[PDB]
């Protein structure tokens, strides 16, 4: 049988898999892996697509967006996802990861998906949390929201990020949803005197965006190459990437003209 | 109403659609065109999908990225395809375009979708004709395939290029089918001292790739910006897009090694 993408409504892809080999649900989430030829494995987070054999991407790109922009990173924060295969990339650099989930029950039923499950679930400077109000005060150099996060949100974590730090979180894809990454760069704006929307160069299986957004740091200006070139064990990430992420076609740049803050 | 789109055979896309609005076929081509709510029509022509709302993006892409990498272009050349945008965005420049079609009964058929179909068909500077031969032997300075061309193919065009001459051409996406651009850029390789691999960025939905190739005449060194900053009708189409379009995540960079030439 296949399970179906959402792109657009009137735009669908459709997976054929091998046999669905877990399910799990919760009271606020639903939780299927299924066997895949093309992707090895696929599962299905709530209405969305994670595929195994090309994890490394985004876990990638936005772990070093970050981490090859800044000079130090102790605390970095990652919120609103399941995601640990970011957390792993960022065990790359001289850092704590305070990871917040709420719902153990989902993100520990990705055991064997996340091929880095149990290296990150052992780190000594990974902590979970089911909530913010869990933690411990303090401010963070990096801070990653897994999902389009509304004013509300956005005015939270703003707050406890540092003066030097960087808040990378996602939205829709720029081109196919030009008003809606519109819309993630004006809330953006109102906090932030830099806020510029990226994609991951040549994923074409997904409508998904990203904004780069910060107090001063500039994601190109404040580009780092030693700590890009002393990685190791990356097959995505490198300067080329880095670079092309952020390149906007000259329509989207005038669009957007008033919602950028460079 | 939906017509498919095969990614894999074991991935496909789905496009809702109003209605058909045309069905012409040759003995060799079949068109389609049908109305869609997401990109006003789509024309599916041979399973290649064309979508109306958006041509200018791969007709800015493909027209400039030779045109702005060269000081002068009189003799351009285009073959196995229909994209007459091409042309049109082509027309920018002062020049002299041959276009070979053979099948000009579904040519004609796009008389309504192209939006510049007419201009450029009563261009002065405008040739069509059905094959190579039928017309005056001479040089080009660029050379557009439409379409992955065999080694037969190549070996031709390759003997009507001029010294510092460019041709440009088409394969696949390398992110779920790097082989088939290895081999590409393999065919390539043997008989051009440049061969580089390019995608259009922020094009999601396309697993189409293309080659940039030459005797010397580089896409990145020889780019020149005073001829990008000179079109002022383009809206996709500039130098950031120019650039990104060549970045290569760190695997597929180590694998076409032995085909890259840069």
């Known amino acids: 049988m296949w399970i179906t993408q959402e792109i657009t409504p009137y735009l669908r892809k459709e997976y054929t898999i091998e046999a669905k080999l877990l399910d799990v649900r919760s009271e606020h989430n639903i939780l299927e892996i299924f066997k895949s030829k093309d992707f090895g494995e696929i599962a299905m987070l709530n209405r969305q697509l994670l595929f195994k054999n090309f994890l490394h991407i985004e876990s990638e790109l936005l772990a070093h967006m970050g981490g090859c922009t800044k000079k130090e990173l102790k605390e970095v924060l990652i919120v609103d996802g399941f995601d640990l295969e970011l957390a792993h990339q960022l065990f790359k650099y001289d ?18 998906f996340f091929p880095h499950f149990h290296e990150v ?9 089911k909530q913010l109000l869990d933690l411990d005060i303090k401010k963070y150099d990096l801070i990653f929201c897994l999902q389009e996060p509304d004013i509300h949100r956005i005015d939270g974590l703003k707050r406890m990020l540092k003066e030097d730090g960087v808040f990378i979180s996602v939205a829709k894809h720029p081109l196919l949803e030009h ?12 906090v932030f005197s ?16 990203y904004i780069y957004a910060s107090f001063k740091t500039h994601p190109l200006k404040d580009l780092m190459t030693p700590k890009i070139e002393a990685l190791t064990s990356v097959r995505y990430y490198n300067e080329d990437i880095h670079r092309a992420a952020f390149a906007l076609p000259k329509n989207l740049q005038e669009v957007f003209k008033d919602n950028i803050k460079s």
């Open 194 to 209: 830099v806020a510029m929307p990226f994609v991951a160069p040549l994923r074409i299986l997904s409508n998904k965006g």
């Open 179 to 190: 008003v809606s990454m519109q819309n993630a760069l004006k809330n953006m704006g109102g």
């Open 121 to 129: 679930k052992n780190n000594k400077n990974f902590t979970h949390a």
């Open 95 to 112: 850092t704590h990861i305070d990871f917040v989930q709420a719902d153990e029950k989902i993100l520990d039923s990705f055991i064997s």
